[PDB]
Amino acid sequence: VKKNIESGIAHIRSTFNNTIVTITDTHGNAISWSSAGALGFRGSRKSTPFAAQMAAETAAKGSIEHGLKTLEVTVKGPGSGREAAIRALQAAGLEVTAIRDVTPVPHNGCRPPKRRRV
């Protein structure tokens, strides 16, 4: 009954305040996901490399039961946790397949808000 996907793609959103790990299939259907908030980190430790590491580890050890043998990386967003995230993803044993050049880079878009000092 369980669709045993052979390989999928992982979308990771790094931020200065949180890190989200989502594992998807070829069509982008949500397979498994985890975040620093789920691990237990409630303060600013969410965006830490260690928190990203734990989130990636949990996502990988959750998708291992779902069955995917390999995955693709689609990390995105600012932050320093993107390194420990991929490090844990590789250490988990689920070899990565490929990567993409996707990014939210806007040409002009809308003007950001006021700074944090005025």
Binding site: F41, G43, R45, T48, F50, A51
Partner: protein
Amino acid sequence: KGPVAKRDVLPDPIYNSKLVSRLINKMMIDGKKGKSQTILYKSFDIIKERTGNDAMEVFEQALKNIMPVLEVKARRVGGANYQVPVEVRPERRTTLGLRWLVNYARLRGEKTMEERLANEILDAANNTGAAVKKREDTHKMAEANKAFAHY
């Protein structure tokens, strides 16, 4: 600046050990090293008497039990007052074990420091003990502060 060296005196006829010499150096009050030496000798004798085993192995196991692996060091990065787990070098581990042993032994409360230290060495060889309460609290703090394993 930089670190500094030091040394101690190992030879001790009753259960020869450098750590035993360091313990003798500890627990000493008012420059009375003879009192501490006698206390340690009599405590080890009581241990050997009550328990049919050499006090050296019991002391080694008590040290192995009480020695803390991880230390939780405070650090004030902004208005948060965070803490950072730290790996304790063997020297600091031994010194902390000696400190906890002596302190909790004298805190227990009995008719003689000899019996106090004997019962403390026993409750250290058997993980259930006062100094091991401190060890467990330190380990719990280090685990709760795992978020800052490294800056």
